[PDB]
Design a protein around this ligand. Structure first.
Ligand SMILES: *[C@H](O)[C@H](C[C@@H]1CCNC1=O)NC(=O)[C@H](CC1CCCCC1)NC(=O)C1(NC(=O)OCc2ccccc2)CC1
Ligand SMILES: *[C@H](O)[C@H](C[C@@H]1CCNC1=O)NC(=O)[C@H](CC1CCCCC1)NC(=O)C1(NC(=O)OCc2ccccc2)CC1
Lengths: 306, 306
């Protein structure tokens, strides 16, 4: 038993991290087969940032302007191209450590692990969610751009995030691995702000099921609620609407614990209206929303990877 | 910016995990050079558990009774010995993935990353502290024994924990890698209980400094306190005594933020006496104690590893 904010083992991704230097900017790249992926703002200078035209900026570059360091081995760049907001540097060496992998664009509410890196070297791993407002609440300093977020399915790494920038509220914005920003953000120094966020309802409910699986039951009650009457309460507390599809996804957890999904919703209702009254759930004094239903099942049943 | 409960990159440890099967018991081993380390209760049967004599149990074993699987390659055992509560299985193949490593026995209050494993395959990584009562609040199911906890210093893995058992409160007990239990626990099915725990004061203070570094300051005040008068307050709230050595360790964080250690203690005093009044710190509604001063400095300055 026990329940922890668990990240995926990072080894398959660590073998892919490289350093990319162009001009006065250094950041991380992701090396898969003979391509290094990195944020295109690496080609920016301290006087391009206001309104760059990256197409113009890139046509002025030569391959030898890109300095790619994989540990203590320089990789020679033999071609480059831009895909949305990511740069793809073709190098003459295929990464022998390349895992089985996919690029995936995730939905808000989905979680992933972030391997934070500086100068191509990993610093740490932690678990994130894509917030409903398409930011992530990460931990990123200067130099961390190009760190990636990922999930693992048995032997396959699904890359879903690469880091680009920090917004004025101290939250983070980035792209999928094909260079498309999550949310309305752009890689340009202009007025940009996160916008109002909401709590991921289906995830809170999953975490309440995790609590029950692990022996916290003080928050349960005998009541039920309808989906409609629940969402009327969620609306008021800045919670995402719960859909029937959410209810179906919570089916396995409902069946394992014997607590119908709508009964768990009635418990969440009372927690929202009454607070916890100085009590904790799974070591938290807040309602936690960065565990998906799949995360709960993975951790409570012991799924492994290869 | 941002502050997350960050684990070390797990790749160097993933390359060391193996499966150890003896009789009807399967668990994980740690493969370093030509030795596999695993909990000695692997030699127990479902009718030895009450009061085993492991010396007797082990002399009855043959090398071929130990089935060691490193992925889809069986490793042949050529010798075995017992060191305290760990079994050391000598195999005919040195692990080519063996990192630079140390075995270290940590003090209560120190943190580490746990690579949770089943059948020799990693499941996830998360950050723990050794509690003052020598338990850890982990996430462990049947089959997870032999998972290890570790820290990394630049290129060296310092192994500090290997998992053995779960106590009746749902917390976890285990050994250093030389087989010595943390705390009074024994690998025997008898009445054992964690005992009263306390909050790690020096770590709470470190985390308050992390909050200041990251822009939460609402909890600061103009007051100060003496060490004595602080510890009189900590005593009452089941907090560990703060020593002068703790104060010295918090020196760098004090100097970076400009907030004297004893001034931060006065802030912690008021938080203990008044609560947070519905406010959060670094996304928590509780005072967090599983970040050491070194953890805060590592994450806020961007230390990497190789
Ligand atoms: C890359 O390593 C780095 C990481 C970043 C540093 C601090 N924390 C982080 O996560 N990214 C940047 O430094 C990034 C570079 C620019 C991105 C846009 C294209 C030009 C390069 N800069 C930022 O993170 C910042 N913010 C920003 O661009 O967003 C909008 C904004 C910022 C400030 C006021 C109003 C609006 C912080 C510059
Ligand atoms: C190994 O993989 C496994 C992990 C453990 C299962 C559930 N969560 C976990 O962390 N360890 C065990 O199953 C372990 C085996 C025994 C250890 C002692 C020597 C014989 C083998 N068993 C336990 O974890 C348990 N508890 C225990 O021994 O502690 C004292 C106790 C337990 C129950 C009542 C009173 C006192 C749970 C059996």
């Amino acid at each position: 038993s026990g329940f922890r904010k668990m990240a995926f083992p990072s080894g398959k991704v660590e073998g892919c991290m490289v350093q990319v230097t162009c001009g006065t900017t250094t950041l991380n790249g992701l090396w898969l087969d003979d391509v290094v992926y990195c944020p295109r703002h690496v080609i920016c200078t301290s006087e391009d940032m206001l309104n760059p035209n990256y197409e113009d900026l890139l046509i002025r570059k030569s391959n030898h302007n890109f300095l790619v360091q994989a540990g203590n081995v320089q990789l020679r760049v033999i071609g480059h191209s831009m895909q949305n907001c990511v740069l793809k540097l073709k190098v003459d060496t295929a990464n022998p450590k390349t895992p089985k992998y996919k690029f995936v664009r995730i939905q808000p509410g989905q979680t992933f692990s972030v391997l934070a890196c500086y100068n191509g070297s990993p610093s740490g791993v932690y678990q994130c969610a894509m917030r409903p407002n398409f930011t992530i609440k990460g931990s990123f300093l200067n130099g961390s751009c190009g760190s990636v977020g990922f999930n693992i399915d048995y032997d396959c790494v699904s890359f879903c995030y690469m880091h680009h920038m920090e917004l004025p509220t101290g939250v983070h914005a980035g792209t999928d691995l094909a260079g498309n920003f999550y949310g309305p953000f752009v890689d340009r120094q202009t007025a940009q702000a996160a916008g109002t966020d909401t709590t991921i309802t289906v995830n809170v409910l999953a975490w309440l099921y995790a609590a029950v699986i692990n022996g916290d039951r003080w928050f349960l009650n005998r009541f039920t609620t309808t989906l409609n009457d629940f969402n009327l309460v969620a609306m008021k507390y800045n919670y995402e609407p719960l859909t029937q599809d959410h209810v179906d996804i919570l089916g396995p957890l409902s069946a394992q614990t014997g607590i119908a999904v709508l009964d768990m919703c009635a418990s969440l209702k009372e927690l929202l209206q009454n607070g916890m009254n100085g009590r904790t759930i799974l070591g938290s004094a807040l309602l936690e929303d960065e565990f998906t239903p799949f995360d709960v099942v993975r951790q409570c049943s012991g799924v492994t990877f290869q």
